[PDB]
């Protein structure tokens, strides 16, 4: 448990040091892909429950 904690604390600091491992273009690709899929299905977003949803 202590060894895995020392590994996790090391890899999180390595992520904070080396920056994000994802590029911007792949993020734009998956974002526009999700946009095209959700606009293809006419998905209505989940609203916040205002005062009394009665469920």
């Amino acid at each position: 448990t202590r060894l895995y904690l020392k590994a996790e604390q090391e890899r999180q600091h390595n992520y904070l040091k080396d920056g994000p491992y994802i590029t911007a273009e792949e993020a734009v690709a998956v974002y526009t892909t999700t946009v095209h899929w959700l606009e293809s299905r006419r998905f209505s977003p989940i609203p916040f429950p205002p005062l009394s949803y009665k469920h």
Partner: peptide, 16 residues
């Protein structure tokens, strides 16, 4: 990644 998760998650629910 949590920022990418937030950007993909703001399409389906309220932003808060």
């Amino acid at each position: 990644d949590l920022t990418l998760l937030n950007r993909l998650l703001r399409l389906i629910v309220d932003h808060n």
